[PDB]
Curated annotation (Swiss-Prot):
Main subcellular location: membrane
Phenotypic consequence of residue 102 to T: In PARK7; loss of protection against metal cytotoxicity; decreased detoxification activity on methylglyocal-adducted CoA
GO molecular function, one term: cytokine binding
Pfam families: DJ-1_PfpI
Source organism of this protein record: Homo sapiens
A GO biological process held by the record: regulation of mitochondrial membrane potential
Signal sequence coordinates: none
Protein name: Parkinson disease protein 7
Alphabetized InterPro entries for the sequence: Class_I_gatase-like, DJ-1, DJ-1/PfpI, Prot/Nucl_acid_deglycase
Effect after changing residue 16 to D: Strongly decreases enzymatic activity
Membrane topology of this protein: Lipid-anchor
Amino acid sequence: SKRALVILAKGAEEMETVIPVDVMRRAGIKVTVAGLAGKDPVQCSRDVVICPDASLEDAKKEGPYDVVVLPGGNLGAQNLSESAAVKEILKEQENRKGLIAAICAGPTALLAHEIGFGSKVTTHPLAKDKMMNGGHYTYSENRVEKDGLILTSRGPGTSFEFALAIVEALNGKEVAAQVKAPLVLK
């Protein structure tokens, strides 16, 4: 089975966390929800409290992962951006030619850690100016943007598309179609 690391920080957007975790698990991906600050429950941007599967410290020991997923959330992405541990995980994933996926404000952590410079990326419209500071990427308005091993998306309302793009990248178009079928997507 393919494996996914979802890094969960205080202030993460809980929809952008839960939709990818759930959709990936429907696809048969083994997902580890890893708490940035350890194993304790994480208060998300609208106060939903999610209990991680493991601390990031422990989850990094059980890698590598076929995808590292970064949810958004204003404070969540800021916490991801400030973490030396996240920087190392993202640098290693980039070096082993592994997929990195980030949604909404999540891609601004790629900028903070100098990941994937020169990629075509999207973000939430409100995060565009922060992501484009320094001209280190090319911007896209697409709801999901995949440029090689850098996969980005825009908002809670693109989370299903984002998650199914991860599933397609890891498990193929047929598995993604299977998972999509009962979701009643528009």
